[PDB]
Amino acid sequence: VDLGSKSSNSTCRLNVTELASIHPGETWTLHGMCISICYYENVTEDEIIGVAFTWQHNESVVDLWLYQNDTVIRNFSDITTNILQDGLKMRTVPVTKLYTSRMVTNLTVGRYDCLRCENGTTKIIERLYVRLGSLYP
Amino acid sequence: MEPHSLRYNLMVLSQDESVQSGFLAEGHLDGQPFLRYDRQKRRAKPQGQWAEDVLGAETWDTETEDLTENGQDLRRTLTHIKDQKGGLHSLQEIRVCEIHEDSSTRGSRHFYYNGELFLSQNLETQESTVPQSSRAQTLAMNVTNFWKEKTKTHYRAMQADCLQKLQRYLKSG
Ligand SMILES: *[C@@H]1O[C@H](CO)[C@@H](O)[C@H](O)[C@H]1NC(C)=O
Ligand SMILES: *[C@@H]1O[C@H](CO)[C@@H](O)[C@H](O)[C@H]1NC(C)=O
Numbered sequence: 272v273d274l275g276s277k278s279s280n281s282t283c284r285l286n287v288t289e290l291a292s293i294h295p296g297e298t299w300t301l302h303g304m305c306i307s308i309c310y311y312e313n314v315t316e317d318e319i320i321g322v323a324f325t326w327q328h329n330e331s332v333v334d335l336w337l338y339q340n341d342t343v344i345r346n347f348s349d350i351t352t353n354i355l356q357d358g359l360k361m362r363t364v365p366v367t368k369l370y371t372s373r374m375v376t377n378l379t380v381g382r383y384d385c386l387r388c389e390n391g392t393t394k395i396i397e398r399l400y401v402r403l404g405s406l407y408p
Numbered sequence: 409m410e411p412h413s414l415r416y417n418l419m420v421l422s423q424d425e426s427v428q429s430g431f432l433a434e435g436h437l438d439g440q441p442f443l444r445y446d447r448q449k450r451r452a453k454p455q456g457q458w459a460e461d462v463l464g465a466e467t468w469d470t471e472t473e474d475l476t477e478n479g480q481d482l483r484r485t486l487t488h489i490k491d492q493k494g495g496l497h498s499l500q501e502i503r504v505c506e507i508h509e510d511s512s513t514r515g516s517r518h519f520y521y522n523g524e525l526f527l528s529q530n531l532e533t534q535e536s537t538v539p540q541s542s543r544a545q546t547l548a549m550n551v552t553n554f555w556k557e558k559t560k561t562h563y564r565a566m567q568a569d570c571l572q573k574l575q576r577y578l579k580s581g
């Protein structure tokens with residue numbers, strides 16, 4: 272699967288096996304909550320961006336959803352736990368946000384990597400680890 | 409045990425057909441003020457010693473951007489409310505999210521025109537409620553029609569924003 276923008280000559284072939292070793296722009300962990308909100312400036316019409324999900328319990332098991340031209344072009348393979356899995360464009364600044372909100376279960380714990388192609392290489396702009404736990408402190 | 413909560417209170421004003429520049433805003437966390445908005449500097453700022461010294465300073469960068477987006481949206485909405493009467497008019501939005509002791513969440517927004525509730529929306533279910541009055545119905549039709557011209561995504565994203573912030577603020581304390 273390809274990410275990035277053909278018009279900007281910045282396309283990258285996704286290799287999920289390489290994601291673990293990529294240094295993310297920002298990285299954090301939530302316990303008992305799965306809400307990832309990734310911030311993309313100056314997204315072009317043809318640019319494919321998205322979110323990879325690597326299961327906590329098997330690093331080889333990776334899901335993906337993809338966004339292009341303000342529409343979801345690929346859902347997670349399992350959407351039953353999804354509360355929100357879509358993008359939106361802000362009005363006051365030229366920013367597109369990708370929202371991934373899911374029920375936290377033994378099947379959604381893991382690593383969520385917000386992806387972008389830059390100069391034909393895969394970047395991770397934000398990485399969120401999700402773990403079980405009590406939302407209420 | 410009472411739920412944890414994050415509450416935003418924004419207000420915009422109009423007179424003689426012109427929506428004033430800027431907006432008013434405040435935020436409360438678990439019932440206590442933590443956020444104020446400097447309308448001149450156009451900056452969210454801490455309210456109280458706890459918000460000043462405990463919350464990360466990045467809090468105010470994020471809140472400034474988020475309030476600006478919300479406040480400009482509210483200015484736009486007021487522009488499209490039909491009211492040709494003179495005088496100072498106000499549109500206020502109260503937005504709240506909660507985390508309950510059983511770890512479940514709630515979220516809603518409520519709109520007041522000249523102090524009168526005319527529309528409430530449940531941000532988790534997308535259900536809207538309008539008071540039984542001819543005036544409130546007219547106002548709510550006015551607003552909801554303007555919005556019509558990603559609805560579900562829009563409302564759920566507001567809830568996601570709020571919940572993410574609440575979780576972060578609770579951790580800091
Ligand atoms: C994906 O990445 C791994 C690690 O670099 C590499 O061994 C493998 O050859 C790559 N797969 C493809 C199809 O390029
Ligand atoms: C996006 O594009 C605008 C207009 O060209 C430019 O001013 C701005 O710096 C760009 N944003 C970023 C963060 O690259």
Ligand SMILES: *[C@@H]1O[C@H](CO)[C@@H](O)[C@H](O)[C@H]1NC(C)=O
Pocket residue numbers: 316317340
């Ligand atoms: C993006 O979507 C719009 C429809 O909303 C369409 O008119 C436009 O051609 C699309 N752009 C591309 C490059 O697909």
Ligand SMILES: *[C@@H]1O[C@H](CO)[C@@H](O)[C@H](O)[C@H]1NC(C)=O
Pocket residue numbers: 329330331332
């Ligand atoms: C992890 O996933 C890979 C790829 O599906 C599979 O080959 C492997 O058996 C799994 N390992 C475990 C311990 O579940």
Ligand SMILES: *[C@@H]1O[C@H](CO)[C@@H](O)[C@H](O)[C@H]1NC(C)=O
Pocket residue numbers: 343344345346350
């Ligand atoms: C993603 O899932 C939604 C809900 O089932 C569906 O409406 C939409 O067509 C799906 N999109 C794709 C590209 O599979």
Ligand SMILES: *[C@@H]1O[C@H](CO)[C@@H](O)[C@H](O)[C@H]1NC(C)=O
Pocket residue numbers: 376377378
């Ligand atoms: C996984 O979680 C579900 C609830 O989502 C629960 O019913 C099930 O027992 C769990 N299974 C394991 C092996 O943890």
